[PDB]
Amino acid sequence: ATFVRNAWYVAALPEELSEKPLGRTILDTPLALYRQPDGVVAALLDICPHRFAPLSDGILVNGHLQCPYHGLEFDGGGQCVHNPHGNGARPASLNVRSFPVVERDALIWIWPGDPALADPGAIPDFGCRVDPAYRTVGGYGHVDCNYKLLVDNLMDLGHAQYVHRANAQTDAFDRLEREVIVGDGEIQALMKIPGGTPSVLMAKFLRGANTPVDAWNDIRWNKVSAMLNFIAVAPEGTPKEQSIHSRGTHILTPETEASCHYFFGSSRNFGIDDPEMDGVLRSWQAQALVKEDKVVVEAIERRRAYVEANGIRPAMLSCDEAAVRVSREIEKLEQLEAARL
Amino acid sequence: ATFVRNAWYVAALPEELSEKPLGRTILDTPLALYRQPDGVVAALLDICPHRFAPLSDGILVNGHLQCPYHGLEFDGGGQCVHNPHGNGARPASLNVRSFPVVERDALIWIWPGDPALADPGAIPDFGCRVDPAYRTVGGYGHVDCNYKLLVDNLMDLGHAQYVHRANAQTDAFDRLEREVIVGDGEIQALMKIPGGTPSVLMAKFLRGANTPVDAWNDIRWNKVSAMLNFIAVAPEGTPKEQSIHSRGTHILTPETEASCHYFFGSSRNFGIDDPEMDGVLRSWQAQALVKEDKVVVEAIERRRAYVEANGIRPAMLSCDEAAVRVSREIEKLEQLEAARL
Amino acid sequence: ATFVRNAWYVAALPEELSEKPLGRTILDTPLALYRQPDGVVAALLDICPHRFAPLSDGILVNGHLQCPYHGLEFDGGGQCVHNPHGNGARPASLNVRSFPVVERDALIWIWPGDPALADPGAIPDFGCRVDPAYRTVGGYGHVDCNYKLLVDNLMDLGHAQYVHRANAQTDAFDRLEREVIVGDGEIQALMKIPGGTPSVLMAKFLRGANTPVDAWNDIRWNKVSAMLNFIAVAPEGTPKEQSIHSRGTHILTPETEASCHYFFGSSRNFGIDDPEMDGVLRSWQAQALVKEDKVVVEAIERRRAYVEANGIRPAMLSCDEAAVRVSREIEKLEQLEAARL
């Protein structure tokens, strides 16, 4: 019910789209997503203007999406280009709503709000996903929880030990200086852990000069729910730029009030020509989502009714600064938008 | 919530009933339908007056339906004929509601509204279903959509050109000529496809024949939601009257606000003793009706919340006259009834 | 929505609890139930004070329940005993709600209401369950009906003549004699079946029986929804006291407004060292209690919307005295509680 509609959201990964329409709901809005013959992606409201049939169940006819019910045909902009009935007249009432869409950084971005306010330049920067110097692997996941629970999750390092123990684990609670930098529509949480233990994968690409001052775990948040992290390791006192690292794409898109779409990916600068490494990284990310984070957040969503019926508020700990700030920024965006409705 | 209760609806096909009660909900009213030992069908509110147990889960005892909970027995009129407890007294408070019911034309009709207005003069004529000159085959289907969506569907048979493409597509669709006749309590939509190649289905009716043909697809609607179509095909310019045809029964009965019962059938005057022709008609009913149409209308029902939340209204085409008129007649019946209670 | 929270309810059977937490909802309240290393049972609100994760999905760490999300640890009283984050401070806001709990008579009792009013001395007496002179076997069942429908069911044991026809029908039902004893927070219904043929079940307990049989079916109800019955059968003219019997535990605990937990058991004074009798009772509990009654009450729950929408009230028979009285006592408790906010 309460979404920030005036913002860019990822609706799909390029590989998911083709001439066969994909029906997907974004912010309670049903969409028909498909790639036209010229290769350009189109996004139409998945509701035919005639009698409301799902356009996503149709097929392309001469490059145009044909409604599966009575045959009306539409172009990528939503204009009805063919009416096979009667005099074949095509009044403006037959056009279907079209959404601004941009394919960039191996992501399909969509603006579900006021179309007059959609500026391609305000789209988050995920350039690493299409940089020849990086190898990117990823996927899609559906989760039955409000998207804000997963934003909280991604902005927090404290559950790694208990939720992702299979991968991330430690035994130190005396050393932890994470700085949170608040910008405009952007927030970064930087963490540098000297003497940090490199991953099993990034270790294979290290020669030898371990010295307490060489491990990073950072994350950047952009307007609403798009995040990119930075997991890295270095020899000694070398800068972040010259380290072995992976930039992780973690973008959430609300489906309904209690469900969301999760687009994940890893863009690494090591083992670039290792095909079996691709399967590995993609599976661990999938595991971290499906088999672990999903279980936790879906259980929390199931407790929302009780917490709201009663007046229960969360008790924050020292590790919640970044999440709390992002949570507050999203709230402000919800209010700023409602102050127009 | 909004149903036209003062009208006759089909609650079951004769073959579905026996001494074993059938529990079925009609217009949000749970019914217990069964055939008494004398062969007469009975319809009782499926709620025992004592503690509300489902009478439909009981069995007949000496021709009377016995409640499975504490044994009260009832006759076809809903009168409690036996109370096995205490002095065995049977006060009027123990009688269960009974609904007017009429078995006619191989259909079981029921009046769910004001029993004092049960006007049998209003039972639609489906005589072809029991005419020895016709062969009838049919079935039952349950659909998760408001019944009005299927009424719309059946009054626009032209959708077959797209929804039933593989069997009904016709190269002469663009030469279609339709008219609409409005009479006393009845609306008819006539369609004619002249001098074209028979569709895949029509070919089977003519036993794999080619050569130009004239087609007719007419449909009659009667008060609320009972329809009978006319599908005919014949060579060149032969008389519509002396043509090979099938009269299709298509009757809808609301179950809940968002679900309905669909009773379909085909009464043909050709291939009367041909088992393979029976198979062709049954294949068509299972594929087109039970599958194809269901997919479309159920997807539309899922889009109702969005269309209502926003102020979206349908855009009518030249082929919608008949459906729009029936839709308006049903609306008037809803208002005339609401102005009563 | 309307529950009598100020009363003791059974939340589990001792055998269901261990160091692995059991998540269960009682009166719309999610609980985490577990046995601490010292063997004492604990009951905490299954919602972590930090971010609301289910504590029931956690494990015990050094005798304390650890939240599976970020590691907070709690003691049986709900006090946070360990915070692994930052300075490890533990403000009062980190404690979780704990519920008064008492393990007695092989039952786990919990007080879901005002903790200040919980008095262990008001817990129903089910001593037979731990008396060395009796052999007790039982189990748990979940039912999708408001708990009051099952209380009604248990207070009218006469339904067994029809609902459990195959197992308990007696040909002397017509000569039954009832008595009802009313007390403070207690109501008893007595039934006597004089000189009849033993039912299939009673014959199983007796291991034969030629001569006529006297059967007793008594049941005691205590404040809210805890019942204990008395099933006895004897030959020719043996008195009820000095005889062979089983004391049946039948306790219901509301889960939601339309669902409940059913704890059943049989404590017999015959065949104490007989495995075959154990099977007979478990077979009965599985068939009659978990299958047969469930079908009836769940069907009734499905008819509640219709009966309420219309103004339908139940018509009582001569066998409803006990049930009606308990129903009235429960209503009074609901009102007395609603009158104090």
Ligand SMILES: COc1c(Cl)ccc(Cl)c1C(=O)O
């Ligand atoms: C849906 O109406 C029909 C059409 Cl348009 C073509 C062929 C048949 Cl068999 C029917 C039928 O009555 O089922």
Ligand SMILES: COc1c(Cl)ccc(Cl)c1C(=O)O
């Ligand atoms: C449901 O109460 C019973 C009746 Cl009515 C007959 C026999 C038995 Cl064993 C029980 C029981 O305690 O489950």
Ligand code: FES
């Ligand atoms: S609903 Fe799309 S053309 Fe009719």
Ligand code: FES
């Ligand atoms: S509920 Fe039908 S006789 Fe009791």
Ligand code: FES
């Ligand atoms: S939700 Fe329990 S420790 Fe964070």
Ligand SMILES: [Co+2]
């Ligand atoms: Co074009």
Ligand SMILES: [Co+2]
């Ligand atoms: Co996580």
Ligand SMILES: [Co+2]
């Ligand atoms: Co009779």
Ligand SMILES: [Co+2]
């Ligand atoms: Co159709």
Ligand SMILES: [Co+2]
């Ligand atoms: Co301790």
Ligand SMILES: [Co+2]
């Ligand atoms: Co510590």
Ligand SMILES: [Co+2]
């Ligand atoms: Co029973």
